[PDB]
């Protein structure tokens, strides 16, 4: 009952912080300040707040639906994080987060510059993923902290279910990357252009879910479907390095622009297809010649309404194209004036992408064990 | 799920209101506006909140000791308003309250005057407590309903164990009475002294409470203890009118102003220590010659802790005078400077000793059955 309790009450106080930040920033923020860093700085614990609140939202779906998540992860069939403890993580951290900007919007006692409460909030979330007394789900900490450790070292652990299901989380978080690698940007030379090291940063996630299918690949020694999921992942690499290479010979006058312009055009097109069908045939498994009445579905659909995977599908198809534009515009000089934002309006929509495709391909993985992780 | 889940939003809700109260009076307010008329008129719905909160600590605390209040009561043994409900219903009228003051703080939208913003918030509460609609506790609303009704027309129900204990509320709860009439006074004359009619109204209570013991005595013809409890509540009766006169006959300058506050301080010295008393002896019923090696205490006592019953009787003997104090000051010119506050501060205080005497005066009911209700 105390969980319920809690959960209720960081979801006020929340919200009413929400409203206060709404009404400073129309009010005492006016229109003034290079407030862009913050928004940067803040972006990535905003959509980290929002992840966890849709992955609780997410593992309620699953126990409502009969989904078994918790064989699918491997954990312990019983002493499991329920939704309510994710919405109460969420709750407080977007309490902190919402302190945080407040007192950076206020400009709180002088003594500590308004440079440490970002600072001071990053590191309290650090401190509380990683400290070792044993008090707040120390043993959920503990099995994250060691699969964020074998998913960062992907070429040598052997890849279970929860690596590659972080990792591809990972691929559709990696606007924390980027922030965190503006942000040691902006302190260094600053304070408190178009470079190969951002698009590497970038390219990160993609990279650690190329190499786990590698090693997959390796382990089985079957090309499809590792080898193809391999090449899937690498389409972002070619599209990648062909907006870098395009706003490099656009930054210096050269005139062969065009072709890395076409390259790109036709890469991102690729790779929003390829990253389309894959979702929509393999990962969550539809269109199957299977399907009796469920038009264009599976023959068995767990959830219950037959609308839901329509509108999957519809919002799946927009949203594929939406990331890799943003993917794109954010590690690339290519749209210096709307970028920005697009960027800000896009993360959250791609969280809330990754949160649908959360629903459909644990389905896929309950129903026919669609990763082959199962013997 | 969702009645705890609503505890904790509006909690939440009202805590963060709290402090933005709290900061917009320091701020915003600074210090200008006859503001007192304010709190006059907030003063009642606040107390009625702490009322409803402690009501519901009252609840828990009977139900965790073993106290039958349900049986006491006359109510159903089950379908009955749980300590969740009660302070979910002080949540969001301690929001609305709140909003209320808010607005009457910050000034909105200006086709609306700030002469109505208290007035919306009484008349919705109004409204919630007697709507037909069978919708908010509407079960609750309508046996509370009914029970006041046979209160205020006290002469003629004959009382049960709930009338008698409503009046006594109520009794604990006489300034809601004055600052409705204080209301009344300033929304007709001064526009959005001393006179029989205030003392009229602080008196109501106990007249109430007189009446109905007057009314048990003629139903069971036994002086003691139903007489003696009607001396009690006429011992205010006194106090009220010599305080009255004491107050005519110095704002007048008449010279028979210290006979006057003689018999007054003599009759405050009567009935504080009557009601102490009847409340150690009677309501709670301690001391007892049957008290083995709880000292000063009774035979049997449900509550864990033997210290709580000391602190309660250290804490009534304090109330009981700092209430008569404030009954005197409320309805009597009798202190011009510093009474106001004193009555802002008493008020809740005598609302948190109602408090502590709703667990004796329940358990002494559950243990001997001191009100002679149960045949």
Known sequence: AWTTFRVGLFCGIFIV????????????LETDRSIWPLIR??????????????LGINTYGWRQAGVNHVLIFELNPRSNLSHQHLFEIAGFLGILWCLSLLAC????????????????????????????????????????????????????????????????????????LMDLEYMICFYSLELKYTYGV??????????????????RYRDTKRAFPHLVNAGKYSTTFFMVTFAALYSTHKERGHS????????????????????????????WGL?????????????????????????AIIEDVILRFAWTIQISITSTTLLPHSGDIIATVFAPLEVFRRFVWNFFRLENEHLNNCGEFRA
């Open 105 to 176: 919007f206020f400009a709180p006692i002088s003594v500590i510059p308004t440079y440490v409460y970002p600072l001071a909030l990053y590191g309290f979330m650090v401190f509380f993923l990683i400290n070792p007394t044993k008090t707040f789900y120390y043993k959920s900490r503990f099995w994250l902290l060691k699969l964020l450790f074998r998913v960062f070292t992907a070429p040598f652990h052997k890849v279970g279910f929860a690596d590659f299901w972080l990792a591809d989380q990972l691929n559709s978080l990696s606007v924390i």
């Open 287 to 311: 269109f199957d010649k299977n399907a009796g009445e469920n038009t264009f579905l599976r023959e068995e659909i767990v959830y219950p309404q037959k609308a839901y995977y329509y509108c």
């Open 198 to 215: 951002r698009a590497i940063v970038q390219c990160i996630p993609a990279w650690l879910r190329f190499i786990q299918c590698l090693r």
């Open 256 to 283: 062969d622009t065009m072709v890395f312009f076409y390259l790109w055009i036709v890469f991102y097109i690729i790779s929003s297809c390829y990253t389309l069908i894959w979702d929509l045939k393999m990962d």
């Open 41 to 54: 700085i803040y972006r990535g614990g905003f959509l980290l707040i929002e992840f966890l609140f849709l």
């Open 17 to 28: 912080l929400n409203i206060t930040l709404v009404l400073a920033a129309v009010f005492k």
